[PDB]
Amino acid sequence: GLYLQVGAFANPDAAELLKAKLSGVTAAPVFISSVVRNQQILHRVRLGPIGSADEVSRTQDSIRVANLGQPTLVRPD
Ligand SMILES: CO[C@@H]1O[C@H](CO)[C@@H](O[C@@H]2O[C@H](CO)[C@@H](O[C@@H]3O[C@H](CO)[C@@H](O[C@@H]4O[C@H](CO)[C@@H](O)[C@H](O)[C@H]4NC(C)=O)[C@H](O[C@H](C)C(=O)O)[C@H]3NC(C)=O)[C@H](O)[C@H]2NC(C)=O)[C@H](O[C@H](C)C(=O)O)[C@H]1NC(C)=O
């Protein structure tokens, strides 16, 4: 499965809001992965798993149309 990251935030409310907005533009699962980085909590807003490269492309397009960020492929850890 393929995964996108749409943003990463120190403010968890910003991450939750972006997650909620993304659910309106994609059918793929949207989730927050929070990690410790540089002595702070970083809330990463991600989606997937997406089943194909073509669906990834169209999902990136939909996110840009919605002005929700510049989504990039990531691999989960
Ligand atoms: C190759 O390295 C990887 O590059 C990635 C490049 O995309 C990088 O991901 C990005 O990481 C940056 C931080 O480094 C992250 O930026 C956040 O950007 C948003 C804007 O989209 C900020 O939000 C806005 O802030 C302004 C005021 O500053 C507000 O007025 C505005 O309302 C905010 N917007 C929203 C929607 O709420 C955000 O700052 C707010 C204040 C917050 O933190 O809550 C920035 N955060 C930080 C911590 O700086 C950007 O979103 C993110 N892009 C994507 C697509 O994920 C990778 O770094 C991230 C952190 C990661 O590792 O997961 C790079 N990876 C590594 C390992 O270096």
Author numbering: 266 to 342
What are the paper's exact sentences on this?
In order to characterize how the SPOR-RlpA domain interacts with denuded PG, we solved the X-ray structure of the complex with compound 1. Co-crystallization and soaking were both performed in parallel and resulted in two structures for the SPOR-RlpA:1 complex at near-atomic resolution (1.30 and 1.48 Å, respectively). The two structures are identical (rmsd of 0.16 Å for the 77 Cα atoms); the description provided herein is for the 1.30 Å resolution cocrystallization complex. The electron-density for compound 1 bound to the SPOR domain is excellent. The PG-binding site in the SPOR domain is located within the concave face of the β-sheet (the “palm” side in the top depiction of Fig. 4a), presenting a short funnel-like cavity (15 Å long by a width raging from 8–18 Å) in which the tetrasaccharide is ensconced in an extended conformation. The positions of the sugar units have been labeled 1 to 4, corresponding to NAM(1), NAG(2), NAM(3), NAG(4). The largest number of interactions is observed for NAM(1) (eight polar interactions with four atoms in the NAM), and to a lesser extent with NAG(2) (four polar interactions with three atoms in the NAG) and NAM(3) (five polar interactions with four atoms in the NAM). (iv) Several amino acids participate in the stabilization of the tetrasaccharide, but only the side chains of Q270, R302 and R309 are directly involved in the interaction with the glycan chain through polar interactions with oxygen atoms of the carboxylate of the lactyl moiety and the N-acetyls of NAM(1) and NAG(2). It is noteworthy that these residues, together with R311, build a basic patch critical for the binding of the carboxylate and acetyl groups of NAM(1). Most of residues contribute to the stabilization of the glycan chain by the formation of hydrogen bonds with the protein backbone (residues 271, 273, 275, 276, 333, and 335) or by stabilization of the hydrogen-bond network mediated by water molecules.
